[PDB]
Amino acid sequence: MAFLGAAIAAGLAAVAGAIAVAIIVKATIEGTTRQPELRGTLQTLMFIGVPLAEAVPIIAIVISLLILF
Amino acid sequence: MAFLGAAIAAGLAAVAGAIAVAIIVKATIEGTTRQPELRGTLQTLMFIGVPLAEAVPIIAIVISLLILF
Amino acid sequence: MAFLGAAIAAGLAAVAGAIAVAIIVKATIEGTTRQPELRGTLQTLMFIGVPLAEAVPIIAIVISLLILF
Amino acid sequence: MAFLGAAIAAGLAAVAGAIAVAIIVKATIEGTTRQPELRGTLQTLMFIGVPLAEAVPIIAIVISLLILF
Amino acid sequence: MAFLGAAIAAGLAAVAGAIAVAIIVKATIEGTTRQPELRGTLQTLMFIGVPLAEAVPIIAIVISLLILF
Amino acid sequence: MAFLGAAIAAGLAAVAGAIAVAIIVKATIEGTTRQPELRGTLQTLMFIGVPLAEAVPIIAIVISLLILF
Amino acid sequence: MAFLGAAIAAGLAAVAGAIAVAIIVKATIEGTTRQPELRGTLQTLMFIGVPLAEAVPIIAIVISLLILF
Amino acid sequence: MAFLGAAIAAGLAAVAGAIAVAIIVKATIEGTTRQPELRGTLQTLMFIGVPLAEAVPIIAIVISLLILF
Amino acid sequence: MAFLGAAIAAGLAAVAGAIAVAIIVKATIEGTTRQPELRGTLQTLMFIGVPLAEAVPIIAIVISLLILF
Amino acid sequence: MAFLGAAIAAGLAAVAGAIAVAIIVKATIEGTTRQPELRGTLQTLMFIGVPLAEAVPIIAIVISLLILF
Amino acid sequence: MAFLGAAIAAGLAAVAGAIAVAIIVKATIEGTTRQPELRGTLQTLMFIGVPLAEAVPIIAIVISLLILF
Amino acid sequence: MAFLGAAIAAGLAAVAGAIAVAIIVKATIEGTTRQPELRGTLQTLMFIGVPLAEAVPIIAIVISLLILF
Amino acid sequence: MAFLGAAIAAGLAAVAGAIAVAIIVKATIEGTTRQPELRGTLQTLMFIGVPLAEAVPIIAIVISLLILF
Ligand SMILES: CCCCCCCCCCCCOP(=O)([O-])OCC[N+](C)(C)C
Ligand SMILES: CCCCCCCCCCCCOP(=O)([O-])OCC[N+](C)(C)C
Ligand SMILES: CCCCCCCCCCCCOP(=O)([O-])OCC[N+](C)(C)C
Ligand SMILES: CCCCCCCCCCCCOP(=O)([O-])OCC[N+](C)(C)C
Ligand SMILES: CCCCCCCCCCCCOP(=O)([O-])OCC[N+](C)(C)C
Ligand SMILES: CCCCCCCCCCCCOP(=O)([O-])OCC[N+](C)(C)C
Ligand SMILES: CCCCCCCCCCCCOP(=O)([O-])OCC[N+](C)(C)C
Ligand SMILES: CCCCCCCCCCCCOP(=O)([O-])OCC[N+](C)(C)C
Ligand SMILES: CCCCCCCCCCCCOP(=O)([O-])OCC[N+](C)(C)C
Ligand SMILES: CCCCCCCCCCCCOP(=O)([O-])OCC[N+](C)(C)C
Ligand SMILES: CCCCCCCCCCCCOP(=O)([O-])OCC[N+](C)(C)C
Ligand SMILES: CCCCCCCCCCCCOP(=O)([O-])OCC[N+](C)(C)C
Ligand SMILES: CCCCCCCCCCCCOP(=O)([O-])OCC[N+](C)(C)C
Ligand code: NA
Ligand code: NA
Ligand code: NA
Ligand code: NA
Ligand code: NA
Ligand code: NA
Ligand code: NA
Ligand code: NA
Ligand code: NA
Ligand code: NA
């Protein structure tokens, strides 16, 4: 039950984080394609946004380990 | 049952928080691409919107922990 | 059952709240990118809309805590 | 089964009400962007539509409370 | 089972009624935005349409109460 | 089992009836917006199509009552 | 088991019939809007098409009652 | 199990057949609006396609009745 | 288990078959509408494709009957 | 367990196969509509693609029978 | 359990393999239609891509068999 | 439980790997069609992306085997 | 439950990572096709984005092995 729990928590967090980053990274690739001169502005948005999007997935991962220990 | 509960809360919280942020960050990246001159305005919307979107997912994380402890 | 229940309520409230805020903030970012003069106008709608969209999710959070305590 | 029932009613009602509101608010933001002279008219539609959309979710919340108490 | 049933009936009715109302209201807002002269005509379609969409969700709320009591 | 059954039939009937009506009403709001001279004509199709779409959801509500009583 | 079965059969039949009708009535409303002189023509296609789409859902409703009785 | 099986078979057959016919009728309505001259030609394709689409659902309904009786 | 099995095989076969045919017929209708002079040619693709698409659903139907009997 | 297994393998194989073929056939019909001179070319792509798309669904059918027998 | 296991690996691998191939082949057909001069190069892409898409679906099929045997 | 596990690992790995490869191969085909001068550029992108996308599904396949042995 | 747990974590991790990488690689390909000069800029974004998006999926894989061993 602890195993199932930890797995569901880890599993959903993986999906959460991976898709979220992918959406953001795509956005900056498309924007950069549209406006090469905004490369740096766009990249900084990516670097701010990724951590924000991974925050709760990371927490859920931690909880996943707490369930396992 | 406590493990499963906590996993579900954290897992769904992860999905909610991560995707929400991505939608918002993407919108911001796109907007800034269309209108570089609006950078700051759009970044303010991001910084306001992100916390607002995280609020309930964060509360569900607190509940996930209350279930575990 | 109480743990499982508390989780289902909080988890679903997280999704509901996070996604609804994303949709509203994204529309606000988009409206503003399109018509920068309506920046304040669109901001006011975001500030009215968000509490409205969070209302039921927040009540579900309370019910979650009630199920738990 | 009461906890599970309460949660299910409350969580679904939260998804229902939050997303319904997001859709209505997003329409209002899009409409006001295109036709700013109509902001009042549209805001009235939003203030009518929102309560209408929240009606069954709230009754489900009330049912969630009856299941608990 | 009475609790689980009542909650399933009420949860689904809320999803049904709220989303359906949102869709209709959105349409009315988009329509009124394109053709402001039609605002009353469109509003009458909303007021006729909303009760029709809510009809069966309301019946299912009654059934939810009949199962609960 | 009766309770669970009645709720599944009522809840699915609600989703069915509410969404279909919404689809049909949206379409008549959009059409009326594009071709206001067709107001009456389109309203007639709405009034024909709504009962038709509600037919089977209503039989299922009846079956829902038969399971409860 | 009979109750569950009757509910599943009737609930799936309601979704089926209601959505199918909705798709056809919508197509009819859109078509009529684009070509008002084909009102009768298209209305005939609706009246042929609806019974065809409703056919199996109605059989499933018969099976629902056979299961209930 | 027989009841639940007959129900799954008939309910899936209803979803399959109603949606399938709706897709085909819609195409026929859209085609006729686009190129009204082909009314009869498209109607023939509809009359050929509807029975073909309905074939496996109807067999599944028969299997439903075999499971029941 | 036999009953449940036969119903899953048959119901899934029905959805596969009916929707596959609809997609192909829809395409043939759209094709014919755009290029009336290819009527015969597009029809022949339809008569080749339906049997091909229906091939595995039909086997699934045989397996459903093997399970029953 | 063997009946439920055989039904799952077969019913999934049916959805896999039917839908894959429908997607390929539709693409052939659309291509032939747009470029009638490529008829034979596109038809050969269809005849290579369909067996390939069905290879795994077909193996899943064999495995389904191995489970029954 | 062995049976149910083999069925899930096989049906999943069937869905994965068929749909992937359908997407790749549809791409080849659409591209060949737009730029027939690239028939050979697009066909090489497809003959490289299809096996790569099938790699893990085929391994999963091997596992399904180890589970059975 | 082992069989079931192994099957969930391998079937999800199959879906994951297959669809991902299809998305990438499709993108390669569509781009080469728009810009045949870049067929080698695009193909190098494809040969880099594919192994990356398969990394985790391949590992997950290893795990599936560990579970089974 | 350890087996089932490890499989859920590894399988969800595979879907997460595969799709995220694919979305990103697709974006890179589309951008490179639209703007061949940015080839290297876009490729760097891809080499930053991929490791990022696979981070949490990799942690879930690690967790999958913990659960197993
Ligand atoms: C458990 C299932 C996991 C996978 C669920 C689906 C994964 C894919 C999610 C991403 C889908 C949406 O993409 P996107 O980049 O926002 O497109 C934006 C397109 N524009 C450029 C026009 C804005
Ligand atoms: C349980 C697993 C759940 C997986 C959830 C995955 C959901 C991903 C949804 C992301 C897609 C939405 O993207 P977005 O930025 O709103 O743009 C959409 C509108 N435009 C393209 C025009 C901008
Ligand atoms: C476990 C289940 C998780 C569910 C996750 C579902 C994610 C849904 C995300 C929805 C994102 C899209 O929103 P939106 O901007 O209103 O549409 C865009 C419309 N425009 C084309 C006008 C821009
Ligand atoms: C279990 C949790 C489920 C969460 C599901 C969330 C889904 C939210 C999707 C809502 C999408 C709302 O976009 P829409 O009204 O089509 O925009 C159309 C705007 N234009 C008319 C300008 C194009
Ligand atoms: C259990 C979770 C349930 C969540 C379900 C969410 C469903 C939301 C679907 C409704 C999305 C919008 O649709 P609509 O406004 O009719 O069309 C869009 C209008 N245009 C055609 C002009 C773009
Ligand atoms: C239990 C959860 C059930 C949720 C079910 C929600 C279903 C909502 C989808 C129905 C709204 C769709 O609107 P529509 O008029 O077809 O526009 C679609 C956009 N076009 C007109 C361009 C096609
Ligand atoms: C549990 C069941 C939940 C209910 C599921 C709801 C499904 C709703 C799907 C209904 C979608 C409406 O399609 P349609 O109007 O034929 O397309 C119109 C396309 N054009 C307007 C661009 C031509
Ligand atoms: C349990 C779920 C039951 C409800 C499922 C609803 C499925 C709706 C399927 C789609 C219904 C209508 O789209 P369609 O006729 O394919 O044309 C769309 C493409 N065109 C715009 C070119 C015409
Ligand atoms: C009951 C549970 C299972 C229900 C499954 C129902 C699924 C029905 C979905 C049928 C949709 C098929 O649309 P179509 O004609 O290929 O057009 C698609 C054209 N575009 C891709 C360009 C939009
Ligand atoms: C039990 C589960 C059953 C699920 C059944 C779902 C079936 C839905 C399949 C729908 C596939 C539709 O794709 P398509 O028409 O090839 O794309 C058309 C795109 N263009 C027109 C732009 C080329
Ligand atoms: C449980 C089993 C359910 C299986 C249901 C699988 C349904 C898969 C349907 C997937 C069809 C996707 O088509 P596609 O190639 O992306 O075309 C998109 C056309 N354009 C790129 C031009 C826009
Ligand atoms: C059991 C679950 C089975 C799920 C099967 C999922 C089907 C695969 C996903 C659907 C196909 C996604 O096509 P894509 O090339 O990414 O976007 C479209 C490319 N354009 C930019 C041209 C629009
Ligand atoms: C077991 C269930 C597994 C389901 C996995 C299904 C995954 C489907 C992934 C398909 C997502 C494709 O999004 P994307 O590449 O951003 O297209 C964006 C194209 N535009 C920019 C034109 C919008
Ligand atoms: Na973008
Ligand atoms: Na945007
Ligand atoms: Na918007
Ligand atoms: Na509208
Ligand atoms: Na319409
Ligand atoms: Na239409
Ligand atoms: Na059509
Ligand atoms: Na077509
Ligand atoms: Na592409
Ligand atoms: Na892109």
Residue numbers in the entry:
A (entry chain D), B (entry chain E), C (entry chain F), D (entry chain G), E (entry chain H), F (entry chain I), ...: 1 to 69
Can you provide the manuscript's text about this entry?
Most living cells depend upon the adenosine triphosphate (ATP) generated by F1Fo-ATP synthases that are energized by a proton- or a sodium-motive force (pmf, smf). Energetically down-hill ion translocation across the membrane through the Fo complex is mediated by successive interactions between the stator a-subunit and a rotor ring (c-ring). Translocation involves ion binding to an unoccupied c-subunit, rotation, and subsequent ion release. The c-ring is attached to the γε stalk subunits so that c-ring rotation causes rotation of the stalk.
We solved the crystal structure of a novel type of c-ring isolated from Bacillus pseudofirmus OF4 at 2.5 Å, revealing a cylinder with a tridecameric stoichiometry, a central pore, and an overall shape that is distinct from those reported thus far. In contrast with the distinctly hour-glass shape of the c11, K10, and c15 rotor rings, this c13 ring resembles a “tulip beer glass” appearance, in which the only slightly curved periplasmic side transitions at about the depth of the ion-binding site into a more significantly flared cytoplasmic side. While the inner helices are remarkably straight and only slightly tilted by ∼5° toward the c-ring axis (as seen from the periplasm), the outer helices are more curved and have a kink in the middle of the helix at the key carboxylate residue (Glu54). The more relaxed positioning of the helices in the alkaliphile ring is caused by the structural impact of the alanine motif AxAxAxA that replaces the glycine motif GxGxGxG most often found in the first helix coding region of c-subunits. On the outer helices of the c13 ring from an alkaliphile, two prolines located one helix turn below and above the ion-binding glutamate can be identified in a motif (PxxExxP) in which the first proline, Pro51, is specific for alkaliphiles. Within the groove of two neighboring c-subunits, the conserved glutamate of the outer helix shares the proton with a bound water molecule which itself is coordinated by three other amino acids of outer helices. One of these belongs to the side chain carboxyl oxygen (Oε2) of Glu54, whereas the three others originate from the backbone carbonyls of Leu52 and Ala53 and from the backbone nitrogen of Val56. However, several lines of evidence indicate the density seen in the binding pocket of this c13 ring should be interpreted as water rather than Na+. In contrast to other rotor ring structures, no residues from the inner helices contribute to ion coordination in the c13 ring. Although none of the inner helices contributes to ion binding and the glutamate has no other hydrogen bonding partner than the water oxygen, the site remains in a stable, ion-locked conformation that represents the functional state present at the c-ring/membrane interface during rotation.
